[PDB]
Ligand binder design. Structure first.
Ligand SMILES: CC(C)CCC[C@@H](C)[C@H]1CC[C@H]2[C@@H]3CC=C4C[C@@H](OC(=O)CCC(=O)O)CC[C@]4(C)[C@H]3CC[C@]12C
Ligand SMILES: CC(C)CCC[C@@H](C)[C@H]1CC[C@H]2[C@@H]3CC=C4C[C@@H](OC(=O)CCC(=O)O)CC[C@]4(C)[C@H]3CC[C@]12C
Ligand SMILES: CC(C)CCC[C@@H](C)[C@H]1CC[C@H]2[C@@H]3CC=C4C[C@@H](OC(=O)CCC(=O)O)CC[C@]4(C)[C@H]3CC[C@]12C
Ligand SMILES: Nc1nc2c(ncn2[C@@H]2O[C@H](COP(=O)(O)OP(=O)(O)O)[C@@H](O)[C@H]2O)c(=O)[nH]1
Ligand SMILES: Nc1nc2c(ncn2[C@@H]2O[C@H](COP(=O)(O)OP(=O)(O)O)[C@@H](O)[C@H]2O)c(=O)[nH]1
Ligand SMILES: Nc1nc2c(ncn2[C@@H]2O[C@H](COP(=O)(O)OP(=O)(O)O)[C@@H](O)[C@H]2O)c(=O)[nH]1
Ligand SMILES: C[C@]12C[C@@H]3C[C@@]1(C)[C@@]1(C)C[C@]3(C(=O)NNc3ccccc3Cl)C[C@@]21C
Ligand SMILES: C[C@]12C[C@@H]3C[C@@]1(C)[C@@]1(C)C[C@]3(C(=O)NNc3ccccc3Cl)C[C@@]21C
Ligand SMILES: C[C@]12C[C@@H]3C[C@@]1(C)[C@@]1(C)C[C@]3(C(=O)NNc3ccccc3Cl)C[C@@]21C
Ligand SMILES: *C(=O)CCCCCCCCCCCCCCC
Ligand SMILES: *C(=O)CCCCCCCCCCCCCCC
Ligand SMILES: *C(=O)CCCCCCCCCCCCCCC
Ligand SMILES: *C(=O)CCCCCCCCCCCCCCC
Ligand SMILES: *C(=O)CCCCCCCCCCCCCCC
Ligand SMILES: *C(=O)CCCCCCCCCCCCCCC
Ligand SMILES: *[C@@H]1O[C@H](CO)[C@@H](O)[C@H](O)[C@H]1NC(C)=O
Ligand SMILES: *[C@@H]1O[C@H](CO)[C@@H](O)[C@H](O)[C@H]1NC(C)=O
Ligand code: NA
Ligand SMILES: [Zn+2]
Ligand SMILES: [Zn+2]
Ligand SMILES: [Zn+2]
Ligand SMILES: [Zn+2]
Ligand SMILES: [Zn+2]
Ligand SMILES: [Zn+2]
Lengths: 545, 545, 545
């Protein structure tokens, strides 16, 4: 119903005044809070992070004087050694080998171990060797005087097998400069900036400490920063990376979005000719001469510069913070978990029978028995099999949560449960009687008031004062029903049930065990004698559940 | 104060010994733990993941013999069909159409339905048709004999409308090979590796099962892996993707960082000429002849190869693990939530009046009444309107949480609350009196000890023994105050209040309801008669809150 | 043991029937649930998001008529102004400056303030000025008539210092069109689509409202959308971005994966010649004439178009949802936290001594005293120092949790703890005796039954009826042990301990304080007199812990 909707359930709690546990709780809380704040701040987990969208534009500057034997002096400018940056990469030629006046013809292949012949049996028509730029015609010819080489159809004359010139022809390229312009954007945060801001000095050159924001770089300085020789790499070529890192905060109070420049060599410094060391490619300059289609082939060596731009942009997001705080909230209950674990452990009698005698340091931890007593109440499943038995000659109570398979309840021994703090052959007292229940159910009432021979509880004065005092029982009956008037037999039955309940409460205490207790035949039949029923038999114990 | 800071609050708990609930709890815990660990391991949620920064370098190898009618045999090498990779893409020409000796002149447009004229009225000066490479001069001319075509200013002669040669001139390109070198880096984790490790065989060719790590690829094998014909795609061209996936673990015990190669066609296999099928572009070879600037135009067909590199690098991060564990911790309370829900539901009398008779399987679930009784205590808001009434002729108690609008409290009936387990016209007993309170407040005390006619509770012996026994009341007064001596009137007032409290405790039990109970006028005035006040009137009930 | 494994612990709870607190709880729950669902839906936190892998293919269309004084009319087509897209960028030439017939020679540098000389002393051999394309020879020469300029080795004739032609020669480029084909993939989700779907109109041009999915773009329309003049940018050049955003949902019921097109200028609109405004590069057309190697240098201006493709693909993931729900679960306990805080605060007597008199609105909040009483039980650490004292002439109990340093317990005053609701010189009653304990421990028993002079509690009738009634004590002894028979001295000792316990229970109530209470010497020695021990001395109080 509606009134049941408008309810609040609050947990019952025990507040303990202990320095140890308060100190532990506050220590836990302080450490957890400090770590939570540190993790939130260091990794900015209140921020939503967007990756960078980048555009790069480069401008290389410089000329080189080149000496090539033929000796001639020539000047190379940007139109001769570089092309506009494509795909965030730009290339600078540093060395070249040139092969003028090639024609599509038949020619002898350049002398090598493979191409050196002695007759037309060393060559096969149509042969495509992976190390040749031509197709064999099956007959081998003279390259020069004694030298005999296989004939090929190809661009002729064939390139000579020659190493890259040493020193590199454009070794002056280390004095070339490149200006890098980097445009970035965070489309989700709707923010874009660039690496060159107004006021930036435009005549500087980059230095990691002196000019760490000048976007003009001398190539030799890059190689020096990486620990490489420009002179050696310029001979066979290579690949160098220019890294631009953007760690940007777009909160207007803490706003900072500037690039960090870094350098990394990207080509493997392999010396294995099988892996094609360096960076080179073959380029054809086509031209017509005498109506004959000709080709000048250049083997180009140089350094490719890859501009690598990465990073993130962060702005405060409420949902991310809400998620993080929720992910952290459950860590504040670990103090309670740990302290309750301590209470449960140091309440074990083990921790006092063995541990404390050895480690006498841990002895004051015995207060946890009191704490556990004030914290936890233990109950059992009220199964129909549940039964409780008490012996006057003993000092504990027995939970017979087991089915009597024709065994006298006196014989069946159950679990030992402490009492709350504030003639048959199974009879050890000589005042018990055999049950009148059916033979199947006769064993439940085959119980005596004691385990070992001696006196009977029915002779105790308290038995006559509490269980059998008709005045006490009538007062109890009238307490619930002030104006109660009943017949003789009805009143006798009422007083009989009241006497059963009074005995059970006296001997077992808690109504939990009194509801499932079992009266001895001595006390049972004493009560039934004092308050008999007019006619019929007695049902006996019925489990409430 | 400081001592209040050093406190620990622990929840009071009821420990139940039930196989069903323990089994359910442990089942829940095991399933949740297993799923948590599985999710942590499968998606590596203890790791911080960084995307890959990649650099690619390619080396294509191979020559082709080309037959072009004019028939001539020519050899094409890398300088004739490819250029160094730009932007993680490289191109291989497979077919071409050539148009020699173009001049900037006036010429007839090549015959088509659009360009075919019959007079100068079919053409307009300055016309830029989207399907023409020239600008009309307004007059149409003869292309060949009878054919009449519009004149255009353009590069002349105009290209013929011709389909790509079939078969492709460089169909041998399927035997070309490409070596791919891939450098990758994780700048945050400060890790870089590459796809070619020392010891790798350098003469192999890729195969998904036999050589899945050889970075040398035959192009025809790529197309075969994708399910395409190289011969057909080589005619009009296309785009093919080479995917390099890096799923890298940078934990030094579980370290693995190798690439997985895959292939995907990237061009749409469209046959609609409107959508420009294939891959082709027009390229101009410029040359000077007789001081006349000339152009050889080549329509280039071929396959563009895009190298697509993606992936992540993971290393263990403490903060990510802490966040994940916190996000999971709250799932371990669902067992308690569910079991407490069961206890609350099966404690409803509904579950026994209707459910159990039908479904006799669920009958043993009635233990939850006991469990709920031991778990929850229900209390009400102690509003000033709160009132409790008991009738001796009834068996329950009435909570009149309502304002008496001049209505006798005997008439006003309230909610039925169970009792704790252990003459006026509204008078049905004939010993009640009218109230002496103000007429506004006279209705609160217009209550009888019973709802239906009969005897009076004041005649009950327990009334004289408990409520009026001066010895009992003085013992109660002296229990709190051992050495208590008071005047006659003060003692009478004390005993009067004690008698009120004794009646309320006897009939209503709990002090919660006794504090808000209402004495009947019969018992009220009996008590006031036995312990009168010397002078003045009687205030009556005051709500403690 | 196993039976201890099969246990379920449930929290004891107090269910309150209050409109305010139920309403607050349900308000909290509804708000939290609504926000949780909103955050889940808006940011799709049930989805796993994959970044896009993209391939772009472009097709530019259009011809331009160009007027260059020399006046001549020429037609430029794609082979003359564009090259196939590389690295997701394509370039269109819009302007050019041409320098024909360059030779590697010695020449006078073009006249400028820097290059203008008056003698060979203004020039130095080997000089590489950053603003020169040549190397000085040390001697300066005549450029034209009177003009004197430094001689340089370079490609000669040297380029003239001239501004870009105005108007741009290819200003008709704004009528060029580009068709963009975009292939994307989500490898983890195994999904790929493209921007041109079957049925898409192929004759349209993009418009943000009319044709927002046509992938054909007129360049002038792009610049108009960005708010730029194509005519002005075409003179010196620039860079324009075409953004393709993919916000894709791959759930088959909510599936949507289409691109959103956007435009952004990427070059800085700088007018500083130092920063190299615009976009231009120098390109060499090499040719042989009379066996002399010659060069035609073109300074190329134009607009570079960068295709920027970004986005994410989301598909439902169970683990992400499980993590999010767990991160949110702990927010549903904030209602309990807040309401329990209210209960604790409004239970403070402060909130009634000062607050309510001022703010009489908050007065009904006094029910929280009852709620707190029903919620929390407070206990103290049972340290060996713990002691409780009661004075008959006072109305509270004193917790002396302090070590008596030879100070009489009568003098030592401790914390004031309320009682549970239901002759020596330190003696103010004249019936106390000095202790027989050792002088070190004699001060604990130096306590009287009152703080101020007057009568003694031992004269109270309740003292004789409860503490000394031998019948009461024997009944108490026999309640635990029905058939108890003991010697005279043993029975006297039993009754003495029982009398101590009865006094402590009478005066201190709770067994928690009765276990640590201290009997006055008057009552102590009265009891010891009524139930003496045959021989020896009396130990006295021992702390149970
Ligand atoms: C770690 C747990 C236990 C405590 C939670 C701490 C929060 C209260 C902190 C963490 C992040 C903080 C935020 C970090 C960033 C900003 C942005 C800041 O705004 C700006 O700097 C720009 C202003 C603009 O938005 O235009 C205003 C404060 C605010 C919301 C801060 C408010 C305080 C917050 C929410
Ligand atoms: C799922 C919940 C309920 C339980 C939490 C399990 C953790 C205790 C596991 C998960 C991830 C594990 C870590 C996974 C990876 C590593 C890296 C490993 O280090 C290395 O392999 C490299 C050594 C180096 O750092 O140089 C050492 C163990 C450690 C910290 C593992 C320790 C055990 C961890 C923290
Ligand atoms: C926010 C908290 C408190 C409540 C949790 C809500 C969930 C029950 C919702 C959120 C996301 C939902 C899912 C969103 C997407 C899908 C995919 C949908 O499948 C498809 O659309 C494609 C079918 C296919 O997989 O082929 C089926 C429903 C499902 C699983 C939804 C089921 C209901 C879910 C799990
Ligand atoms: N706890 C408990 N209750 C008992 C025992 N014996 C009888 N009762 C209660 O007394 C009632 C049976 O009383 P009984 O002597 O048979 O009189 P009858 O019902 O008129 O036949 C049942 O409801 C039982 O719950 C017992 O040994 N232990
Ligand atoms: N619970 C309850 N308390 C009552 C009732 N009638 C009187 N009292 C208490 O008794 C006190 C009034 O006693 P009263 O007979 O008027 O004597 P007076 O105070 O000297 O006038 C108040 O504090 C009430 O709380 C009642 O019907 N129910
Ligand atoms: N709480 C409490 N217990 C006491 C006090 N005095 C004695 N006792 C208890 O009584 C026992 C000592 O009794 P005592 O008179 O010395 O007789 P004895 O043990 O035979 O010497 C101890 O176990 C104490 O716990 C007291 O002042 N307060
Ligand atoms: C793409 C090109 C065009 C230009 C610029 C460049 C990036 C370069 C490496 C050199 C190249 C060129 O042709 N440079 N000129 C030259 C090269 C070798 C010897 C003498 C001379 Cl004049 C070819 C080329 C492959
Ligand atoms: C950029 C170029 C330069 C080289 C290499 C390449 C990648 C190519 C496709 C072919 C090209 C070239 O010029 N190849 N040569 C040729 C082409 C057709 C007919 C006869 C011959 Cl010899 C032009 C070009 C567009
Ligand atoms: C790479 C090239 C090749 C083609 C296409 C292009 C992308 C262009 C900008 C123009 C270029 C070319 O040579 N265009 N032709 C021309 C240029 C200026 C004056 C007269 C004429 Cl016919 C050079 C080049 C740098
Ligand atoms: C007497 O029975 C003493 C036994 C104490 C058992 C408790 C042992 C404490 C060690 C931790 C056990 C639980 C694992 C917790 C891992 C963090
Ligand atoms: C007896 O029960 C004493 C228990 C003491 C528990 C402390 C065990 C060590 C764990 C300490 C962790 C917190 C740091 C110390 C807080 C002051
Ligand atoms: C007598 O009143 C029996 C009524 C039982 C009502 C409980 C119905 C159980 C079905 C679940 C209802 C809550 C929704 C839980 C969804 C997971
Ligand atoms: C009476 O209250 C019996 C309640 C039984 C509750 C079980 C309901 C089915 C849910 C089971 C989920 C866990 C799997 C079975 C555990 C053994
Ligand atoms: C009498 O002692 C009244 C004192 C009341 C103290 C409580 C003050 C309430 C304000 C909040 C204090 C806790 C901080 C909570 C921040 C969300
Ligand atoms: C006396 O204890 C009255 C306490 C009232 C607490 C409410 C304080 C304001 C916070 C309200 C937040 C929820 C919105 C209102 C719910 C109806
Ligand atoms: C981005 O910021 C600019 C400058 O304030 C504004 O004009 C524009 O509308 C913003 N775009 C979005 C998507 O809000
Ligand atoms: C990265 O690793 C190398 C090799 O150990 C080390 O020299 C370098 O300092 C590291 N860089 C960082 C940022 O720690
Ligand atoms: Na949580
Ligand atoms: Zn017996
Ligand atoms: Zn017996
Ligand atoms: Zn009446
Ligand atoms: Zn009456
Ligand atoms: Zn005294
Ligand atoms: Zn005294």
């Amino acid at each position: 119903s509606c009134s049941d909707v408008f309810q609040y359930e609050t947990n019952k709690v025990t507040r303990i005044q202990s320095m140890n546990y308060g100190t532990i709780k506050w220590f836990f809380h302080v450490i957890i809070f400090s770590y939570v704040c540190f993790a939130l701040v260091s990794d900015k987990l209140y921020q939503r992070k967007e990756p960078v969208i980048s555009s790069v534009h480069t401008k290389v500057k410089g000329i080189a004087e080149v000496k090539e034997e033929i000796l001639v002096h020539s000047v190379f400018d940007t139109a001769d050694y570089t092309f506009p940056l494509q795909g965030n990469s730009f290339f600078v030629m540093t060395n070249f080998l040139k092969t003028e006046g090639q024609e599509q013809r038949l020619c002898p292949e350049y002398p090598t171990r493979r191409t050196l012949c002695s007759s037309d049996r060393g060559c096969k028509k149509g042969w495509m060797d992976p190390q040749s730029k031509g197709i064999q015609t099956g007959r081998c010819v003279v390259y020069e005087g004694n030298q005999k080489t296989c004939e090929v159809s190809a661009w002729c004359p064939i390139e000579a097998v020659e190493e890259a010139p040493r020193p590199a022809l454009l070794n002056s390229a280390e004095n070339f400069t490149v200006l890098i312009k980097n445009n970035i954007d965070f489309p989700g945060h709707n923010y874009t900036t660039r690496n060159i801001l107004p006021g930036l000095n435009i005549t500087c050159t980059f230095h990691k400490t002196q000019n760490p924001q000048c976007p003009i770089f001398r190539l030799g300085d890059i190689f020096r920063e990486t620990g490489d020789n420009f002179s050696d790499v310029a001979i066979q070529g290579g690949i160098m990376g220019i890294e631009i890192y953007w760690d940007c905060n777009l909160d207007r109070w803490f706003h900072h979005c500037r690039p960090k420049y870094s350098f990394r060599r990207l080509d493997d410094k392999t010396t294995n000719v099988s892996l094609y060391p360096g960076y080179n490619f073959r380029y054809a300059k086509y031209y017509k001469e005498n109506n004959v289609e000709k080709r000048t082939l250049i083997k180009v060596f140089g350094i490719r510069f890859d501009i690598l731009v990465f990073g993130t942009g962060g702005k405060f997001d409420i949902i991310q913070l809400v998620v993080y705080i929720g992910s952290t909230l459950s860590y504040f209950g670990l103090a309670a978990v740990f302290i309750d674990f301590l209470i449960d452990t140091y309440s074990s009698n083990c921790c006092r029978s063995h541990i404390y005698p050895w480690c006498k340091c841990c002895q004051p931890c015995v207060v946890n028995e009191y704490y556990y007593r004030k914290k936890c109440e233990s109950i059992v499943e009220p199964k129909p099999t549940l039964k409780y038995v008490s012996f006057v000659d003993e000092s504990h109570i027995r939970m017979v949560n087991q089915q009597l398979l024709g065994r006298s309840l006196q014989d069946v021994k159950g679990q030992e449960v402490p009492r709350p703090a504030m003639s048959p052959v199974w009879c050890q007292c000589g005042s018990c009687l055999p049950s009148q229940l059916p033979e199947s159910h006769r064993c439940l009432e085959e119980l005596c008031c004691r385990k070992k021979p001696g006196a009977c509880i029915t002779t105790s004065e308290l038995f006559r004062k509490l269980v059998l005092s008709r005045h006490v029982l009538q007062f109890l009956l009238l307490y619930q029903e002030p104006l109660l008037a009943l017949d003789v037999d009805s009143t006798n039955s009422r007083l009989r049930h009241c006497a059963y309940r009074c005995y059970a409460t006296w001997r077992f205490g808690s109504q939990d065990m009194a509801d499932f207790a079992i009266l001895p035949s001595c006390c049972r039949w004493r009560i039934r004698k004092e308050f008999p029923k007019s006619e019929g038999q007695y049902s006996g114990f019925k489990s409430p559940y």
